[PDB]
């Protein structure tokens, strides 16, 4: 079950300055980037074109290129329409893409946030506000929904293009997606012990402090933190009495280890 996310971040500081940057994720692996500085979308994997021919890619890129320039003018123009009520600076975020299920099934989505709050989505054949959205957005929605050609294009993007493209990506990027990277662990202290686990992929991992073969239930795992090389980092801590560290061990289970767990005794 993989989620494909196209993420757009647009900042408008005033009437005459904006930037738009995008990144694209398939699960927890980046497949594209698109800087404001670049006229073209950059592949961050060798398989980022998926199963699209070069002609299909160019057509798709070209639609995005037009979108980015148009989007920019449209926001600026919507701001003129609502003022003095709404005004700069403005942050807009888009999250679009699809979630792939087994056997030709998928749900596509297009969610828009305004100043950090989810306010609008594309649903069915039109834009709509979601619950909690301020009512002044009804005018922008009404204007956006007037554009029949954008609607038809977005519909085709969500319904047909996203799932097709992503099915091809899963095939082309199989060996990067199904990779197995081993965690390396190490210990340290500050009383509070720390078991550092780093270098593992995929994300599912089990880490627990133990005496012999007894799970120490005071174990607090922290967040999953990324490494620069597309592997993960996690630290599992444990509060203990000074002097009472004899026979404590850190056990780590991960799919890459193939049964041979890592056990580190203090």
């Amino acid at each position: 079950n993989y989620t494909f996310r196209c993420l757009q971040m647009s900042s408008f500081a005033n009437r005459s300055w904006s930037r738009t940057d995008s990144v694209v994720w398939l699960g927890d692996l980046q497949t594209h980037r698109w800087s404001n500085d670049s006229a073209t979308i950059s592949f961050t994997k060798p398989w980022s074109q998926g199963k699209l021919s070069n002609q299909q890619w160019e057509k798709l890129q070209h639609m995005f290129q037009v979108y980015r320039v148009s989007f920019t003018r449209d926001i600026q123009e919507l701001v003129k329409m609502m003022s003095p009520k709404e005004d700069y600076p403005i942050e807009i975020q888009l999250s679009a893409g699809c979630e792939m299920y087994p056997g030709n099934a998928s749900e596509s989505f297009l969610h828009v946030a305004f100043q950090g709050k989810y306010v609008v989505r594309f649903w069915g054949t039109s834009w709509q506000t979601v619950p909690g959205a301020p009512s002044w957005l009804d005018l922008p929605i009404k204007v956006l929904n007037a554009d029949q050609g954008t609607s038809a294009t977005v519909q085709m993007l969500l319904n047909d293009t996203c799932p097709l493209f992503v099915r091809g990506l899963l095939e082309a990027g199989k060996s990067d997606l199904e990779k197995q990277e081993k965690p390396v662990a190490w210990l340290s202290s500050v009383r509070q012990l720390v078991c550092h686990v780093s270098g593992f992929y995929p994300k599912p991992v089990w880490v627990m402090w133990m005496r012999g073969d007894q799970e120490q239930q005071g174990t607090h795992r922290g967040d999953f933190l990324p490494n620069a090389d597309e592997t993960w980092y996690l630290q599992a801590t444990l509060d203990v009495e000074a002097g009472e560290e004899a026979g404590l061990a850190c056990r780590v289970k991960h799919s890459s280890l193939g049964g041979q767990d890592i056990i580190l005794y203090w």
Partner: T-cell receptor
Framework: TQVEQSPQSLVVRQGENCVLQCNYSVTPDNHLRWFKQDTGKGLVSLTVLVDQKDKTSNGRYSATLDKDAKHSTLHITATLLDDTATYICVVGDRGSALGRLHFGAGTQLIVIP | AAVTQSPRNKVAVTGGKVTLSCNQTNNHNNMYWYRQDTGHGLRLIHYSYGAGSTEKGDIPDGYKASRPSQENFSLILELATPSQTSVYFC??????????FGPGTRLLVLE
């Protein structure tokens, strides 16, 4: 100037057909409208073309649009004296009020009766 | 959807004040002022998304705009010059792309 019209002017005799060209560089190109303007008068819409490869008709006027080539033609069949006017091509860059219109400078037609 | 313009025709002196008015009873939020000059297509001067709003178009220099109400959109030339001799068209529209044009206003600015 992102909208260009050819010919700039032409003279034809009553009953003859003629073809008026519009070429543009406007991006994006949601739709194209053809206007008729009599001398001293205002803008009367003749037709609006919206599809990638579109065709329209309105009596003796017919038109085509190809968005790949960014090209439109207005055909007037069997000209009459009252077709003496300037014909104007307009490209709209959005399917909403957020669009700007990009106007050609027009083609002057004279029909000799 | 009908739009009206007044005056329809106007002779003015350099340095004088000229006001061109446009009235529209369609309840359209959006209004637009253009000028037409030989060898050019219509060019946008000012526009408005509603009462109190005015926006600069492509060639706003020498013109002030005014949107006192939904119905009325005015083009004000405070210090009229001969370069403002032209035919001025007003238009209105709702959220759709169609603009509905008024019949035009001839302006001559004499020295």
């Amino acid at each position: 100037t992102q909208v260009e019209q050819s010919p700039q002017s032409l003279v034809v005799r009553q009953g003859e057909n003629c073809v008026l060209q519009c070429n543009y560089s406007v991006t994006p190109d949601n739709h194209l409208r053809w206007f008729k303007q009599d001398t001293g008068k205002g803008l009367v819409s003749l037709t609006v073309l919206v599809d990638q490869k579109d065709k329209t008709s309105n009596g003796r006027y017919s038109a085509t649009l190809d968005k790949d080539a960014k090209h439109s033609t207005l055909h007037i069949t069997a000209t009459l004296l009252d077709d003496t006017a300037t014909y104007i091509c307009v490209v709209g860059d959005r399917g909403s009020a957020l669009g700007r219109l990009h106007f050609g400078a027009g083609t002057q037609l004279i029909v000799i009766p | 959807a009908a739009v009206t313009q007044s005056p329809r025709n106007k002779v003015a002196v350099t340095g004088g004040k000229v006001t061109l008015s446009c009235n529209q009873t369609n309840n359209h939020n959006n209004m637009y002022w253009y000028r037409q000059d030989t060898g050019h297509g219509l060019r946008l001067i000012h526009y408005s998304y509603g009462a109190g709003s005015t926006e600069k178009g492509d060639i706003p220099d020498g013109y002030k705009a005014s949107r006192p109400s939904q119905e009325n959109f005015s083009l004000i030339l405070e210090l009229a010059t001969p370069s403002q001799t032209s035919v001025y068209f007003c238009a209105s529209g709702d959220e759709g792309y169609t603009q509905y044009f008024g019949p035009g206003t001839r302006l001559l600015v004499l020295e």
